[PDB]
Amino acid sequence: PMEISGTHTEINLDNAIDMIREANSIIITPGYGLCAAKAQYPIADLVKMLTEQGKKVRFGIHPVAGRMPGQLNVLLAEAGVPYDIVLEMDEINHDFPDTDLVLVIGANDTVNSAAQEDPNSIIAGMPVLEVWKSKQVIVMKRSLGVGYAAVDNPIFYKPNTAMLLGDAKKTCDALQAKVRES
Amino acid sequence: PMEISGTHTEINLDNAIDMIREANSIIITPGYGLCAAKAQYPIADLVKMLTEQGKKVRFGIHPVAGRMPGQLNVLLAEAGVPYDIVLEMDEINHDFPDTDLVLVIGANDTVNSAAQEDPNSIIAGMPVLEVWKSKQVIVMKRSLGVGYAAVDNPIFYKPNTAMLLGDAKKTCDALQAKVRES
């Protein structure tokens, strides 16, 4: 017989607010999940407040995030996020090591470390946003489920990764609200 | 006001062979010079034989070694070097203090200690492979000259560094040939 296990951590909204408020630089890497939940709006609002509070907050977009090329740039633009804070993977990937917090919102395949850590993965070698290199990662999705490529993501079990489970819009709505009360 | 002195040491092939034969752990840090001279091939054969003699031989690749992204990884692969012995700087730098011998092959800026020793240097604070922390270093290049950054490299003058001057391919071809014949 055989068996293998994995351990992940889940945090609550209060803990997430703590991490956000303590962080000075933040990168948001959105994916298909944000698109499905139509979460562009609450996250745009949140980003505006954090920026006005003096934090460095930028979006890092994978060339193939979502389901259509440039789909995330369009939705973020529709939410009124400034174009100067929406960067492409190639221009921002190098900032992860120097980043305090990364908010992974409805992204999975585009931030999957198996692309570099598993030689026998089907996405091995494929370029991804290296979010795990930052100080703290908060993953916002409904579960530890798979993405389009149907493969497990090692970042879910890394020490510096915390899962904030729930629909992307609901979670961003709540965060945006609790930050407005600060 | 002051004037320090520095001495470099030039060695010949047989001397390099003795250093290799005597080393249990070897790390190779290749750079632009290896590519230019097309020395991937002889070095690949050399590593195979050494590994076969029981020696732990690995490659340490700097993120910006060569002149294109992943250039050294691609050329070494093509020459048949096992992906499992090619490591990125960040995953191997901590082992230099515990390494017997380092073969710097056509690398300079990526192994320049001035990044850590000269606060006024144009490369100050930039990460480099800390080859000089190992027991013995052998540098293979044509001269005591500069690399792309156009700055002198202090490791050529450290007591544990030996210069094995000449075109990288001509040199690697000879080393592989002598190693074979033993």
Ligand SMILES: NC(=O)c1ccc[n+]([C@@H]2O[C@H](COP(=O)([O-])OP(=O)(O)OC[C@H]3O[C@@H](n4cnc5c(N)ncnc54)[C@H](OP(=O)(O)O)[C@@H]3O)[C@@H](O)[C@H]2O)c1
């Ligand atoms: N960009 C393009 O043009 C294009 C074209 C063809 C294929 N693709 C492929 O699509 C993938 C895109 O990468 P990605 O990171 O964006 O995608 P994914 O890897 O498709 O990520 C989707 C993630 O969002 C979550 N999600 C779905 N609904 C959600 C919701 N309502 N609230 C919160 N989370 C939700 C899912 O997890 P839960 O189920 O746990 O919530 C899922 O794992 C790539 O594999 C790419 O190659 C892209």
Ligand SMILES: NC(=O)c1ccc[n+]([C@@H]2O[C@H](COP(=O)([O-])OP(=O)(O)OC[C@H]3O[C@@H](n4cnc5c(N)ncnc54)[C@H](OP(=O)(O)O)[C@@H]3O)[C@@H](O)[C@H]2O)c1
């Ligand atoms: N990787 C990228 O995509 C990229 C892009 C833009 C800039 N760069 C820059 O390029 C540099 C790369 O670092 P590195 O250590 O590989 O480079 P270097 O510092 O460029 O090293 C080249 C060394 O190899 C030697 N060389 C040239 N031909 C040789 C030959 N035939 N045989 C033996 N030696 C030879 C040269 O010395 P001799 O003349 O004494 O032999 C030289 O000092 C970095 O400063 C990096 O920032 C990289």
